[PDB]
Design an enzyme around this catalytic site. Sequence first.
Site, short mmCIF file in Angstrom:
data_model
loop_
_atom_site.label_atom_id
_atom_site.label_comp_id
_atom_site.label_asym_id
_atom_site.label_seq_id
_atom_site.Cartn_x
_atom_site.Cartn_y
_atom_site.Cartn_z
N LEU A 20 0.83 -1.20 0.00
CA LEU A 20 0.00 0.00 0.00
C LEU A 20 0.87 1.25 0.00
CD1 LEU A 20 -2.70 -1.20 2.55
CD2 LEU A 20 -3.14 -0.58 0.16
N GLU A 22 4.94 3.13 1.69
CA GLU A 22 6.32 2.90 2.07
C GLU A 22 7.00 4.24 2.38
OE1 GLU A 22 9.15 1.70 -0.96
OE2 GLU A 22 9.94 0.07 0.30
N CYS A 24 9.41 6.62 5.53
CA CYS A 24 10.67 6.48 6.23
C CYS A 24 10.44 5.62 7.48
CB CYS A 24 11.27 7.84 6.59
SG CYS A 24 13.08 7.84 6.71
N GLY A 26 8.33 2.83 7.80
CA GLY A 26 8.23 1.41 7.50
C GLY A 26 7.46 1.19 6.20
N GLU A 98 -7.40 -2.27 10.51
CA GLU A 98 -8.56 -2.38 9.63
C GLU A 98 -8.26 -1.63 8.33
OE1 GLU A 98 -12.56 0.11 10.42
OE2 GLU A 98 -11.19 0.12 12.16
N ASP A 148 0.05 14.63 15.08
CA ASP A 148 0.46 14.50 13.68
C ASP A 148 -0.77 14.48 12.77
OD1 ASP A 148 1.99 14.23 11.31
OD2 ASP A 148 2.72 12.24 11.86
N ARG A 152 -2.97 13.50 4.87
CA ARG A 152 -2.26 12.28 4.52
C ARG A 152 -2.38 11.22 5.62
NH1 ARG A 152 3.77 13.51 3.32
NH2 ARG A 152 4.00 12.05 1.59
N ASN A 153 -2.72 11.62 6.85
CA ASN A 153 -2.82 10.66 7.94
C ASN A 153 -4.27 10.33 8.27
OD1 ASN A 153 -0.10 12.33 9.58
ND2 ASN A 153 0.01 10.61 8.14
N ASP A 166 -2.42 6.80 11.79
CA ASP A 166 -1.01 7.10 11.94
C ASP A 166 -0.72 7.62 13.34
OD1 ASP A 166 1.64 7.27 11.71
OD2 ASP A 166 1.64 8.34 9.75
C1 LIG Z 1 -3.03 7.23 7.12
C2 LIG Z 1 -2.47 5.85 7.01
N1 LIG Z 1 -1.14 5.85 7.64
S1 LIG Z 1 -0.41 4.31 7.77
O1 LIG Z 1 -1.31 3.38 8.42
O2 LIG Z 1 0.96 4.46 8.22
C3 LIG Z 1 -0.29 3.85 6.05
C4 LIG Z 1 0.73 4.45 5.35
C5 LIG Z 1 0.90 4.15 4.02
C6 LIG Z 1 0.03 3.27 3.42
C7 LIG Z 1 -0.99 2.68 4.13
C8 LIG Z 1 -1.18 2.96 5.47
N2 LIG Z 1 -2.23 2.34 6.19
C9 LIG Z 1 -3.49 1.93 5.72
N3 LIG Z 1 -4.27 1.34 6.63
C10 LIG Z 1 -5.47 0.94 6.19
N4 LIG Z 1 -5.94 1.08 4.95
C11 LIG Z 1 -5.11 1.67 4.10
N5 LIG Z 1 -5.62 1.82 2.80
C12 LIG Z 1 -5.01 2.40 1.67
C13 LIG Z 1 -5.56 2.21 0.41
C14 LIG Z 1 -4.99 2.77 -0.71
C15 LIG Z 1 -3.86 3.54 -0.64
N6 LIG Z 1 -3.36 4.05 -1.87
C16 LIG Z 1 -2.14 4.82 -1.99
C17 LIG Z 1 -1.42 4.40 -3.26
C18 LIG Z 1 -2.21 4.94 -4.45
N7 LIG Z 1 -1.67 4.71 -5.80
C19 LIG Z 1 -2.39 5.54 -6.78
C20 LIG Z 1 -1.93 5.34 -8.22
N8 LIG Z 1 -0.47 5.47 -8.38
C21 LIG Z 1 -0.06 5.05 -9.72
C22 LIG Z 1 0.29 4.68 -7.38
C23 LIG Z 1 -0.20 4.89 -5.94
C24 LIG Z 1 -3.70 4.64 -4.30
C25 LIG Z 1 -4.04 3.73 -3.12
C26 LIG Z 1 -3.31 3.75 0.62
O3 LIG Z 1 -2.17 4.52 0.82
C27 LIG Z 1 -2.56 5.75 1.44
C28 LIG Z 1 -3.87 3.18 1.75
N9 LIG Z 1 -3.88 2.10 4.45
#
Ligand SMILES: CCNS(=O)(=O)c1ccccc1Nc1ncnc(Nc2ccc(N3CCC(N4CCN(C)CC4)CC3)c(OC)c2)n1
Length: 288
Positions: A20, A22, A24, A26, A98, A148, A152-153, A166
């Site tokens: 999903l 990446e 700094c 993790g 979740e 924070d 984005r969070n 986050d």
């Molecule tokens: C605030 C969270 N903070 S975190 O938990 O540290 C944390 C930090 C980073 C990533 C995830 C998490 N956690 C978490 N937990 C629960 N559910 C989810 N769902 C989720 C669904 C989609 C995306 N994306 C992002 C990439 C994106 N692409 C678009 C097209 N491009 C060509 C390439 C990239 C679309 C889908 C997503 O990334 C935000 C998260 N994520």
Amino acid sequence: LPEDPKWEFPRDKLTLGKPLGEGCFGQVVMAEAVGIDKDKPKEAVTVAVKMLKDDATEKDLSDLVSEMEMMKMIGKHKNIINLLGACTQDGPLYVIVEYASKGNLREYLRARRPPGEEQMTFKDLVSCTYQLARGMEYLASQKCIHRDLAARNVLVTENNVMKIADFGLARDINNIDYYKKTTNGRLPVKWMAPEALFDRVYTHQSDVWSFGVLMWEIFTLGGSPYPGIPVEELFKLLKEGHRMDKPANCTNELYMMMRDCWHAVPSQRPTFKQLVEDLDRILTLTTN
Ligand SMILES: CCNS(=O)(=O)c1ccccc1Nc1ncnc(Nc2ccc(N3CCC(N4CCN(C)CC4)CC3)c(OC)c2)n1
């Protein structure tokens, strides 16, 4: 990591899948977890798993641990991402949360700007803000400072529930060393209450400041705060009275509320409770 009964999840019952994201901090991956929903031990649920990267530091680990401990301590709330469990034994630390299907709020809002892909209504904007205010009113009630807050969070679920996430930097109100030079050194500056730095403290009123930037992000449909202003100049500008301009098409009232959140004196900002009541009103009187 002393084994926690309630929370451990069998490592053989979880299958990692698409990445999903990446940072700094993790990395986070999509995963199937069979039986994480006790009592439905039959059924395999989509989850997100947060873990370290090959290049992780000692501080990376103890941060991930903390984020997990924090999530355990705050209750279930509609507008907070829930911890579902953790693999902490005999292998890498895996923090299972979740899964939100529509990603973070910044990318969600950016994707549905007006074409000049389901365009955001004004009521929809006020709805997110209200939801997030209820989330933060809950957090503050639990003695938790998030520290924070930022678009984005936030996560957006399939039914557009806004989920504060986050918890990497969040603390118990009592677990901040007031006045020490290094306190708050790791807060993103453009989202940060001035007193966080000038005074080296942090309270619920500090989170209000951040909430105000979050509002601005929301009403610009995921814009970048203080555009064309570098972080190293920012506080000199804030002490001088500078504050972001009113987003196009956000109302004078909503803009007064942002401004209120950026009051230089902490106690002069709204409470989350006040922000909830105000947004509740704006939301309902829109619908009518
Ligand atoms: C605030 C969270 N903070 S975190 O938990 O540290 C944390 C930090 C980073 C990533 C995830 C998490 N956690 C978490 N937990 C629960 N559910 C989810 N769902 C989720 C669904 C989609 C995306 N994306 C992002 C990439 C994106 N692409 C678009 C097209 N491009 C060509 C390439 C990239 C679309 C889908 C997503 O990334 C935000 C998260 N994520």
